[PDB]
Amino acid sequence: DDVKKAATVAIAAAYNNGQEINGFKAGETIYDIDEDGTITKKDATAADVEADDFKGLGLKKVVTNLTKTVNENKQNVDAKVKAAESEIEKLTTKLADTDAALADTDAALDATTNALNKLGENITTFAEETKTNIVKIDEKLEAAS
Amino acid sequence: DDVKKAATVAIAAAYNNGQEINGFKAGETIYDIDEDGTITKKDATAADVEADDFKGLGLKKVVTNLTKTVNENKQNVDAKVKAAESEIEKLTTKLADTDAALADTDAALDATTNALNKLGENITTFAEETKTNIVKIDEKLEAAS
Amino acid sequence: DDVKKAATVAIAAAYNNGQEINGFKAGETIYDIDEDGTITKKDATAADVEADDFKGLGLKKVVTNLTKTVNENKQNVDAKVKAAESEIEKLTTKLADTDAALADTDAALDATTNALNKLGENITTFAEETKTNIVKIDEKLEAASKH
Ligand SMILES: [Cl-]
């Protein structure tokens, strides 16, 4: 009967879909359904398993593992980014301390430059007044002879 | 008949696979198939739902949500990395401005050091010529008794 | 018979589940099962395909592609983070070189300030000893005048 065959194909088809969802291993019974509706009862070899889309894991196991990978990869990158941001924060505070110390260096350099200029002007005046006094003395001596 | 039984198992199995793909909720009819091929018509409890791999969501809904998570996690990290890189770009420009200001400080310090050395050489000569002149006058006075 | 119908529904249901796992395309036979258990043999249109959850790809193909996306996105971000960290490492070494050069500038500025102060102290003494000497000579001349 054609109803006997249809029930047989349906069992085999439901069985195979179940293995796609829940997986299979070497030795486990697998059914191959022909275009002619001919059902072949085989046993999954190491080849069938190794060269399967998910290597006999099944859709449920793969999706569960993928969910684990997605979350693990997010935790891992979130912590790498938090590390880099902390390094950036420490470089910012150090660069701010460097700029502050340079501003102090400039203020000290400017006070040193100004003191040098004042000393130079004070020496120039003193040298001019000394020259004038020595010249006056020489003239009093050059006259007294 | 064994064909009656086979059709019944096939319906129950196809129903069960459909729930794995499309999901189930508390109250919804669930079928438990025995190794003996005995089909039990139960009703999904809150336990069956809460302690299910995807909590009755089904493979389609989970994979759809996972695709949403993957893309959302990529947008989120891409923007955190773009933020960190902008902070790095601003630290680079500021450090380059700091090094430039320090190079100017060094040039100004070298000019101050050089002017200080020249001034020191200039007073040494003046001080030497003053000593010579005072000593000559002292001799002119010591002679004139 | 009710067993004839049950076998027919089961075939159609198993066929549909298979399409959800392995996918479909426009033209491919699709079965629509009624609540009444009435099976309708249709042909997937461009609408059925375009407005499907995974657009007829099937669960296997979507999960395989998603695995590719997850790994590609991890490789891509791992390299962007490795790039940023290398930039951070180079900024650290340059900032350390800047701080070292500033410490040298300060030491040189401190030596210049100290040499300026000593010079100012030496000129003051010389200037004081010169006034004393000119003043003594001026007195030796002023006395030698009052005769
Ligand atoms: Cl099925």
Numbering used by the authors:
A (entry chain B), B (entry chain C): 28 to 172
C (entry chain A): 28 to 174
Paste lines from the article.
We determined the crystal structure of NadA3 residues 24 to 170 using the molecular replacement approach and refined the structure to 2.45-Å resolution, with final Rwork and Rfree values of 20% and 22%. The asymmetric unit contained three copies of the polypeptide chain. Electron density maps revealed NadA3 residues 28 to 170. The structure presents the typical TAA family protein architecture; it is trimeric and elongated, with an N-terminal globular head. Despite sequence-based predictions that the NadA3 coiled-coil might be interrupted by other secondary structures in the region of residues 100 to 150 (23, 29, 30), the electron density maps of NadA3 24 to 170 display a continuous 160-Å-long coiled-coil stalk region extending from the head all the way to the C terminus. Within the head, NadA3 coordinates a chloride ion via the side chain of conserved residue N44, forming an N at the position d layer, similar to the observation about NadA5 (30). Two regions in NadA3 unexpectedly contain highly unusual 11-residue (undecad) repeat motifs wherein 11 amino acids form a coiled coil, deviating from the standard heptad repeat pattern. Intriguingly, the first undecad repeat spanning V97 to K107 presents an unusual d-e layer, previously identified in a few right-handed coiled coils and, to our knowledge, never detected before in undecads of left-handed coiled coils. The second undecad repeat, spanning L143 to F153, presents a more canonical hydrophobic d-a motif, comprised of residues L146 and G147. Nevertheless, superpositions of NadA3 and NadA5 reveal different positions of their wingtips by over 7 Å.
